[PDB]
Design an enzyme around this catalytic site. Structure first.
Site, PDB file in Angstrom:
ATOM      1  N   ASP A 180       0.888  -1.140   0.000  1.00 50.39           N
ATOM      2  CA  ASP A 180       0.000   0.000   0.000  1.00 50.39           C
ATOM      3  C   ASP A 180       0.937   1.204   0.000  1.00 50.39           C
ATOM      4  OD1 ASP A 180      -1.616   2.251   1.070  1.00 50.39           O
ATOM      5  OD2 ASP A 180      -3.125   0.720   1.487  1.00 50.39           O
ATOM      6  N   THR A 192       0.923   5.810  -3.562  1.00 53.85           N
ATOM      7  CA  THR A 192       0.804   6.913  -2.607  1.00 53.85           C
ATOM      8  C   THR A 192       1.319   6.601  -1.207  1.00 53.85           C
ATOM      9  OG1 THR A 192      -1.422   6.346  -1.818  1.00 53.85           O
ATOM     10  CG2 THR A 192      -1.264   7.595  -3.852  1.00 53.85           C
TER      11      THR A 192
END
Ligand code: HEM
Ligand SMILES: *[C@@H]1O[C@H](CO)[C@@H](O[C@@H]2O[C@H](CO)[C@@H](O)[C@H](O)[C@H]2NC(C)=O)[C@H](O)[C@H]1NC(C)=O
Ligand SMILES: *[C@@H]1O[C@H](CO)[C@@H](O)[C@H](O)[C@H]1NC(C)=O
Ligand SMILES: *[C@@H]1O[C@H](CO)[C@@H](O)[C@H](O)[C@H]1NC(C)=O
Ligand SMILES: *[C@@H]1O[C@H](CO)[C@@H](O)[C@H](O)[C@H]1NC(C)=O
Ligand SMILES: O=C(O)/C=C/c1ccc(O)cc1
Ligand SMILES: [Ca+2]
Length: 595
Positions: free
Chosen positions: A110, A184
């Protein structure tokens, strides 16, 4: 001195100010500097990059060029001498479920991705690196040391390509080379929804106005969803079994199908999202498609933050948790939330928690079929074992009832990953994750092990004896000192992971320092952190505070027997309770009366 900055291959930044949701690119999280923590920007440098030529070449590129007076050892030799081990007996972590390892890879994904440079499609350059092992440009071949068994069955080297880097994608020569982070820096679920608008939408189901994430229309799991396939050829999930002919999955993050259990954790996440979007519609039937998707997306992001920070981080950090992650004090706009380059390496500690096998378990958590247990390598990019062999429900039982590998100074990385990794577009189960990791350190221009000890306020060993006292290990110190003739040269990856475990935690002092800091920044500099006043309603925050991985399982699988603490070692049927005695995520606080 430090210039206003380079930024050629990055578009425009136009920030909607009222917007209550995150952007897919992560842009606009930070108002004063809106590109902070966004995909496709350079990773941050907590310390100046160190390169052979102080610009872009990696150490170990020019045989004649030493580092601190010495030659750096071949990545594969270090791996062979220190990383490798034969005996898979007694290496399981008595107090960690295999889910512990899996959650780690989910979070790491992530957070960062630093993919290789592109110059290989419609160009045979990729095969020229593989075939003749010629170092040039991006091609940075991992050569086999003299006594390597792979020399005999595989050739002279293992192909390797340098990671992509910002501004030019051909060599520039003025500031040191800065690699790209393609996702991100926020714990936003980028891996479920995407980090590019282009992917994010494709992943969506726009047909119905229900805000659902698009699913597989070719196969199901007892009426439960599967991620859509990615019809891009060549596909490694097809290459591994050409008879089965099942492609890799399409997820928010590109590496989702690398191994079956990651593929599996990805499957659970998509389901929660869909499950959330359907529950919201009922409460707020008047909600449009977009709202359903966004609100659902917002919740799953909070879910990951609670699990990771409440249940995960403490058992990784333990005694050092509080030192670097004091309880939340709210958003600070002066906190840099960009993932740092070295964290993308600190976090690879997870590679020593990967055990040699994976199992499928029946409803009484017993061997599911003739070959319930399988060797890890037959699972790299293996999607057919999920669709053609029982769904995820069996695999999620193995994740709860099996252990992760314990880090061990004499047994660091299992051969499944050390000798048998599969890499796409390459034909064999014959790669080394350890070697790769090391070569990557050099490719990213990483400072040595002592610079990082210095960085953390820890001592900096200069002698064999000094190293022994730090590692609490004579033989390990002796080997490292033989290979790298000075600690100053030990690649951060092998270095940090050599330190013994801090109390109550699974990493040493150095990684607890580096990991802790980054995560602290991840939380404190994220305007949309779930617990940051105003993001969720006080009532919503009370609803969220009750989530659990067990609950995510119960909701999204046909397993009705889960432990309470998902991450610790739990055996059946003792540590297993019925799903009804497990708190639910009551979504009522999301009702919206606008009358
Ligand atoms: C079967 C299990 C796993 C497999 C097969 C796997 C495989 C890989 C591969 C092939 C790479 C790319 C190596 C390169 O740089 O060229 C990588 C990188 C990485 N791995 Fe894993 N890994 C596994 C588990 C884990 C776990 C459990 C963690 C942490 C808990 C982890 C952390 C990382 C990180 C942080 C990177 C660098 C990401 C980046 O480029 O920013 N991995 N892994
Ligand atoms: C390729 O996938 C096929 C399809 O599942 C695997 O084939 C099966 O494996 C056993 C036979 O040993 C059976 O239980 C399945 O019914 C088989 N299906 C078929 C069509 O043969 C096969 O094992 C896989 N091959 C490899 C190399 O992984
Ligand atoms: C989209 O949603 C509709 C309505 O729920 C569903 O029937 C259809 O299968 C979905 N399409 C995809 C590709 O997920
Ligand atoms: C905000 O961040 C800056 C830089 O990291 C730090 O000096 C300051 O103490 C932080 N604010 C709070 C309230 O901690
Ligand atoms: C097992 O881990 C949990 C945290 O997951 C901890 O609270 C418990 O004390 C540990 N058990 C042992 C024997 O250390
Ligand atoms: O090519 C892929 O799909 C992904 C490979 C991969 C790279 C880094 C990981 O941590 C896992 C898989
Ligand atoms: Ca992210």
């Amino acid at each position: 001195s430090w210039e206003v900055g380079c930024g050629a291959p990055v578009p425009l930044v136009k920030c909607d100010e009222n917007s209550p949701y995150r952007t897919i690119t992560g842009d606009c999280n930070n108002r004063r500097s809106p590109a902070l923590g966004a995909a496709n920007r350079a990773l941050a440098r907590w310390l100046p990059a160190e390169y052979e030529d102080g610009l872009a070449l990696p150490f170990g590129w020019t045989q004649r060029k030493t580092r601190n007076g010495f030659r750096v050892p071949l990545a594969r030799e270090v791996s062979n001498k220190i990383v490798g081990y034969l005996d898979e007996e007694g290496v399981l972590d008595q107090n960690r479920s295999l889910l512990f390892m899996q959650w780690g890879q989910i979070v790491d994904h992530d957070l960062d991705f630093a993919p290789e440079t592109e110059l290989g499609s419609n160009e045979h350059s990729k095969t020229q690196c593989e075939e003749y092992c010629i170092q040039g440009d991006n091609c940075f071949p991992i050569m086999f040391p003299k006594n390597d068994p792979k020399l005999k069955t595989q050739g002279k080297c293992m192909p390797f390509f340098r990671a992509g880097f910002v501004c030019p994608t051909p060599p520039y020569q003025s500031l040191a080379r800065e690699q790209i982070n393609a996702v991100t820096s926020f714990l936003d679920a980028s891996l479920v929804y995407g980090s590019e608008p282009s992917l994010a939408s494709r992943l969506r189901n726009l047909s119905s106005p229900l805000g659902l994430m698009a699913v597989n229309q070719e196969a199901w799991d007892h009426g439960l969803a599967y991620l859509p396939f990615n019809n891009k050829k060549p596909s490694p999930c097809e290459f591994i079994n050409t008879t089965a002919r099942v492609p890799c999955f399409l997820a928010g993050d590109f590496r989702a199908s690398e191994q079956i259990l990651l593929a599996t954790a990805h499957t659970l996440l998509l389901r929660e999202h869909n499950r959330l979007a359907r529950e919201l519609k009922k409460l707020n039937p008047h909600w449009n498609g977009e709202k359903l998707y966004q609100e659902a997306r917002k919740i799953l992001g909070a879910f990951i933050q609670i699990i990771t920070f409440r249940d995960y981080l403490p058992i990784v950090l333990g005694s050092e948790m509080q030192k670097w992650i004091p309880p939340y004090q709210g958003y600070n706009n002066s906190v840099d939330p960009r993932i740092s380059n070295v964290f993308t390496f600190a976090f690879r500690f997870g590679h020593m928690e990967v055990p040699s096998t994976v199992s499928r378990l029946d409803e009484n958590y017993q061997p599911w079929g003739p070959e319930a247990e399988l060797p890890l390598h037959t699972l790299f990019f293996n999607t057919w074992r999920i669709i053609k062999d029982g769904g995820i429900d069996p695999l999620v039982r193995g994740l709860l009832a099996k252990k992760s590998k314990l880090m061990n100074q004499d047994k660091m990385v299992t051969s499944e990953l050390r000798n048998k990794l599969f890499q796409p577009t390459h034909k064999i189960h014959g790669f080394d994750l350890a070697a790769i990791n090391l070569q990557r350190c050099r490719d990213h221009g990483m400072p040595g092990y002592n610079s990082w000890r210095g960085f953390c306020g820890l001592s900096q060993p200069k002698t064999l004896k000094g190293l022994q006292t730090v590692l609490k290990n004579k033989i390990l110190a002796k080997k490292l000192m033989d290979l790298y003739k000075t600690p100053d040269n030990i690649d951060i990856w092998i270095g940090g992971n050599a330190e013994p475990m801090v109390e109550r935690g699974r990493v040493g002092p150095l990684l607890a320092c580096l990991l802790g800091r980054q995560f602290q920044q991840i939380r404190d500099g994220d305007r949309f952190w779930w617990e940051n006043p105003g993001v969720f309603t006080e009532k919503q925050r009370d609803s969220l505070q009750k989530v659990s991985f067990s609950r995510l399982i119960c909701d999204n699988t046909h397993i009705t027997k889960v432990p309470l603490h998902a991450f610790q070692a739990n055996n059946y049927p003792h540590d297993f309770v019925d799903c009804s005695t497990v708190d639910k995520l009551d979504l009522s606080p999301w009702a919206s009366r606008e009358n």
